[PDB]
Amino acid sequence: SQAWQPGVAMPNLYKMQRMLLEKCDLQNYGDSATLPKGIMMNVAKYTQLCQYLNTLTLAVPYNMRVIHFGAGSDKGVAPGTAVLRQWLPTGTLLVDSDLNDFVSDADSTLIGDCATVHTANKWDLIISDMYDPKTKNVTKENDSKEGFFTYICGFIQQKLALGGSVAIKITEHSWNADLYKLMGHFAWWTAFVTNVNASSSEAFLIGCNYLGKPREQIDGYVMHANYIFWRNTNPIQLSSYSLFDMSKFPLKLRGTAVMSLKEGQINDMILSLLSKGRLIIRENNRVVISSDVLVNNENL
Amino acid sequence: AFAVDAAKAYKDYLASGGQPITNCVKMLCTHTGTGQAITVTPEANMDQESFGGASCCLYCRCHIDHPNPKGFCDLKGKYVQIPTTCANDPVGFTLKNTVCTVCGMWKGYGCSCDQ
Numbered sequence: 001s002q003a004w005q006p007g008v009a010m011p012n013l014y015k016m017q018r019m020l021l022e023k024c025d026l027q028n029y030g031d032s033a034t035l036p037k038g039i040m041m042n043v044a045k046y047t048q049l050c051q052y053l054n055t056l057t058l059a060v061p062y063n064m065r066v067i068h069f070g071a072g073s074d075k076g077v078a079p080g081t082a083v084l085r086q087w088l089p090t091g092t093l094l095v096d097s098d099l100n101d102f103v104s105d106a107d108s109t110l111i112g113d114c115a116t117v118h119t120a121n122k123w124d125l126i127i128s129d130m131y132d133p134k135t136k137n138v139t140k141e142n143d144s145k146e147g148f149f150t151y152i153c154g155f156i157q158q159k160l161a162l163g164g165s166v167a168i169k170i171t172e173h174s175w176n177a178d179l180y181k182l183m184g185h186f187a188w189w190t191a192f193v194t195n196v197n198a199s200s201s202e203a204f205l206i207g208c209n210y211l212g213k214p215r216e217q218i219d220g221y222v223m224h225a226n227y228i229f230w231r232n233t234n235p236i237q238l239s240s241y242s243l244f245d246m247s248k249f250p251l252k253l254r255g256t257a258v259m260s261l262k263e264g265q266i267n268d269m270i271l272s273l274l275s276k277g278r279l280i281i282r283e284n285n286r287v288v289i290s291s292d293v294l295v296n297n298e299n300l
Numbered sequence: 301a302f303a304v305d306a307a308k309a310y311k312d313y314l315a316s317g318g319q320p321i322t323n324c325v326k327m328l329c330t331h332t333g334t335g336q337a338i339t340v341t342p343e344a345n346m347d348q349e350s351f352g353g354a355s356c357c358l359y360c361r362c363h364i365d366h367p368n369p370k371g372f373c374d375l376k377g378k379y380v381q382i383p384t385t386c387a388n389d390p391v392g393f394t395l396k397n398t399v400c401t402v403c404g405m406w407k408g409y410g411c412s413c414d415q
């Protein structure tokens with residue numbers, strides 16, 4: 001019955017295991033979903049990711065701030081940004097970024113390594129589709145990767161509003177131990193596999209409602225193995241069924257409250273509202289961002 | 301005294317037989333919407349497709365300045381409905397056709413203001 005869903009999330013019993021990391025080998029590896037005429041993979045992917053997110057307790061305030069990393073593509077456009085804007089309430093502030101130049105529907109776009117990206121502001125929702133193609137050059141044991149996953153883990157701890165949520169793309173080899181550990185700083189977490197990319201080890205690590213502190217301790221090395229175990233023993237039929245019904249697609253405008261709070265004010269009652277998607281905590285000042293620029297004169 | 305008519309150039313390249321700009325981002329949608337030309341979310345009716353606007357605008361795609369004296373973009377950040385019969389070239393269509401200031405539909409592809 002999974003085929004009529006947008007995709008499939010890691011069942012809790014696999015999260016609870018203490019598996020060891022195996023190579024990932026999927027029955028349908030390299031199979032491709034049939035897509036609706038003229039529809040790009042990344043539109044279908046992001047659509048199903050948003051459809052899955054409609055089922056969670058996302059905070060959705062007025063003047064929502066969303067930021068999308070790795071939104072470029074080899075096409076020079078941002079298919080996933082287009083879906084996020086469609087999904088998101090009209091007027092949602094949407095910043096995106098990628099190392100390579102692309103044209104976007106985002107309110108602002110920064111080009112460059114994400115580590116040159118800076119903002120004073122906290123955010124309500126962070127999306128990362130960042131992936132290093134050199135990850136394909138597997139020449140050793142599959143260890144936790146740093147690089148952009150280091151920036152991301154920092155951005156979340158520094159710039160994610162309490163009650164905010166994240167969706168961060170990983171694969172068998174594109175993953176990071178601390179990101180998993182940080183998944184436990186959310187009220188709830190999963191690994192979600194879109195049905196149109198079910199023949200991939202790709203998942204989106206989704207943290208639901210940030211709590212700024214660990215709710216549960218997660219060994220990230222162990223959980224990535226648990227994730228591979230799950231994928232290795234649970235083949236997922238490619239399916240694009242859920243792309244056809246867009247009638248309930250738009251993110252509910254919950255009009256969620258926003259409050260600037262100290263760390264002394266975060267009690268168990270406040271914490272419970274965070275965890276229910278009923279509260280966001282952060283400043284509501286103007287949103288300013290920047291990209292660092294290295295200056296050099298090469299002449300002589 | 302010199303600027304470049306980007307619009308004319310693509311209109312001539314298409315006329316010569318050139319292949320229209322590809323990789324315009326088509327949205328999934330209900331296809332039961334208003335049918336209006338340019339909108340803040342997909343509004344395709346049964347006879348249209350909805351695309352993200354940036355990807356359909358010639359000035360954004362070619363990295364060139366926009367005709368507005370402000371450089372503002374009519375399409376970026378928005379969605380454009382394209383007659384399904386022309387969705388092979390959304391950049392051509394948007395450039396050549398004009399939107400009714402009154403009802404919001406494409407003049408000649410929905411605008412029934414005249415009668």
Ligand SMILES: [C]O[C]1[C]([O])[C]([C]OP([O])(=O)OP([O])(=O)OP([O])(=O)O[C][C]2O[C](N3=[C]N([C])C4=C3N=C([N])[N]C4=O)[C]([O])[C]2[O])O[C]1N1[C]=NC2=C1N=[C]N=C2[N]
Pocket residue numbers: 024025026029131132133135136138171172173174197199200201202
């Ligand atoms: C936009 O979205 C893109 C994708 O949709 C998504 C990833 O999709 P993927 O390609 O399927 O990834 P994967 O093969 O499932 O995992 P991996 O970490 O690349 O595996 C490393 C290496 O290990 C092997 N491996 C892995 N697995 C799971 C196997 C298998 N071998 C088998 N016989 N059976 C299997 O089950 C194989 O040799 C791999 O190469 O990431 C995006 N993306 C990918 N590449 C690029 C890119 N974006 C930009 N530029 C890119 N160059």
Ligand SMILES: Nc1ncnc2c1ncn2[C@@H]1O[C@H](CSCC[C@H](N)C(=O)O)[C@@H](O)[C@H]1O
Pocket residue numbers: 042046069070071072073074078079080081097098099100112113114115129130131132147148
């Ligand atoms: N360190 C880094 N900083 C910024 N972007 C990075 C990065 N490493 C990889 N990326 C970007 O991750 C992207 C993967 S392809 C992304 C597809 C796009 N999100 C869509 O929605 O269609 C690449 O464009 C790549 O430039």
Ligand SMILES: [Zn+2]
Pocket residue numbers: 354357358359360361366373374375376
């Ligand atoms: Zn433009």
Ligand SMILES: [Zn+2]
Pocket residue numbers: 400401402403404405411412413414
């Ligand atoms: Zn009219």
